[PDB]
Amino acid sequence: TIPHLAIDPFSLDFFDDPYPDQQTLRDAGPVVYLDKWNVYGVARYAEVHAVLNDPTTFCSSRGVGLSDFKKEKPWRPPSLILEADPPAHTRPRAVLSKVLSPATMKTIRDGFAAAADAKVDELLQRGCIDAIADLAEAYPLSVFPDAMGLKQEGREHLLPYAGLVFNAFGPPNELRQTAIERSAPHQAYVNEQCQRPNLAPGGFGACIHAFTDTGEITPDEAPLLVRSLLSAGLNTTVNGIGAAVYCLARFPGELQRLRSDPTLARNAFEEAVRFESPVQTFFRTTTREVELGGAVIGEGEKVLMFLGSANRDPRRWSDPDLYDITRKTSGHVGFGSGVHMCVGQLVARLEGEVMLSALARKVAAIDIDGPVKRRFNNTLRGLESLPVKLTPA
Ligand code: HEM
Ligand SMILES: COc1ccc(C(=O)O)cc1
Ligand SMILES: [Cl-]
For 206-224, letters b (16+ CB in 10 Å) and e give: bbbbbbbeeeebeeebbbb
Strands 32-34 and 302-306: unpaired
- Give me the amino acid identity at 249: A
Q: Give the nearest ligand 2 atom to 336 CA.
A: 1
User: Cβ of 330: how many Cβ atoms within 10 Å?
Assistant: 7
111: nearest Cα among 142, 137, 153: 142
d(CA 331, CA 352): 18
Structural element, H or E, at residue 5: strand 4-5
- Give me the amino acid identity at 307: L
Domain extent at residue 94: 1-393
Query: CA geometry: angle at 271 spanning 270 and 275, to 5°?
Result: 125
Q: Give the nearest ligand 2 atom to 166 CA.
A: 4
d(CA 281, CA 171): 12
- The residues, any chain, with a CB within 8 Å of residue 382's CB and separated by 6 or more, are 132, 136, 238, 239, 242, 243, 276, 278, 374, 375
Give one DSSP letter per residue of 223-276, joined into a string. HHHHHHHHHHSSHHHHHHHHHHHHHHHH-HHHHHHHHH-GGGHHHHHHHHHHHH
- The residues, any chain, with a CB within 8 Å of residue 232's CB and separated by 6 or more, are 82, 162, 165, 342, 344
d(CA 305, CA 296): 16
The SS3 of residue 340 is: coil
Q: 228 CB under 6 A from ligand 2?
A: yes
d(CA 358, CA 351): 11
d(CA 133, CA 383): 10
The SS3 of residue 359 is: helix
Evaluate whether 313 touches 324 at the Cβ level (below 8 Å). no
Nearest C-alpha to atom 7 of ligand 1 is from which residue? Answer: 335
d(CA 4, CA 38): 10
HSE value, Cβ hemisphere, 13 Å, CA-based, for 84: 17
- For the domain that residue 93 is a member of, what is the CATH number? 1.10.630.10
Nearest C-alpha to atom 7 of ligand 2 is from which residue? Answer: 228
The SS3 of residue 334 is: strand
Nearest C-alpha to atom 3 of ligand 1 is from which residue? Answer: 236
d(CA 116, CA 90): 34
d(CA 262, CA 288): 48
Q: Tell me, what DSSP letter sits at residue 221?
A: G
- The 3-state secondary structure of 160-212 reads HHHHHHHHHCCCCCHHHHHHHHCCHHHHHHHHHHCCHHHCCCCCHHHHHHHCC
**Ligand showing the shortest atom-to-Cα distance for residue 338:** 1
Q: Tell me, what DSSP letter sits at residue 78?
A: P
Strands 387-392 and 363-368: antiparallel
Evaluate whether 386 touches 249 at the Cβ level (below 8 Å). yes
- The residues, any chain, with a CB within 8 Å of residue 264's CB and separated by 6 or more, are 257, 258, 325, 326, 360
Nearest C-alpha to atom 1 of ligand 2 is from which residue? Answer: 232
Nearest C-alpha to atom 10 of ligand 2 is from which residue? Answer: 82
Partners of 292 in beta bridges: 295
HSE value, Cβ hemisphere, 13 Å, CA-based, for 258: 36
Give one DSSP letter per residue of 236-249, joined into a string. HHHHHHHHHHHHHH
Evaluate whether 43 touches 37 at the Cβ level (below 8 Å). no
User: Cβ of 18: how many Cβ atoms within 10 Å?
Assistant: 22
Residue 88 — φ and ψ, nearest 5°? Answer: -60, -25
What's the gap in Å between 348 CA and the centre of ligand 1? 9
65: nearest Cα among 7, 136, 134, 10: 10
- Give me the amino acid identity at 70: K
**Ligand showing the shortest atom-to-Cα distance for residue 191:** 3
d(CA 323, CA 243): 11
What's the gap in Å between 329 CA and the centre of ligand 2? 23
d(CA 161, CA 3): 37
Q: 244 CB under 6 A from ligand 2?
A: no
Q: 120 CB under 6 A from ligand 2?
A: no
**Ligand showing the shortest atom-to-Cα distance for residue 184:** 3
C-alpha separations of 358 from 107, 113, 197, 274, 352 in Å? 19, 8, 35, 21, 10
What's the gap in Å between 333 CA and the centre of ligand 1? 11
> Is 89 flagged in the annotation as binding?
yes
d(CA 266, CA 311): 18
Nearest C-alpha to atom 8 of ligand 1 is from which residue? Answer: 335
Of 104, 194, 345, the one to substitute when testing ligand 1's pocket (max ligand atoms within 8 A of C-beta) is 345
d(CA 154, CA 26): 43
Query: CA geometry: angle at 136 spanning 133 and 137, to 5°?
Result: 55
> What is the resolution in angstroms?
1.6
d(CA 361, CA 14): 37
325: nearest Cα among 364, 273, 363, 362: 273
In angstroms and rounded to an integer, the radius of gyration of the C-alpha atoms of the chain is 20
Partners of 391 in beta bridges: 365
What's the gap in Å between 228 CA and the centre of ligand 2? 5
130: nearest Cα among 392, 385, 391, 390: 385
- The residues, any chain, with a CB within 8 Å of residue 368's CB and separated by 6 or more, are 249, 250, 386, 387, 388
d(CA 44, CA 32): 11
- Give me the amino acid identity at 302: K
How many domains is the chain built from?
1
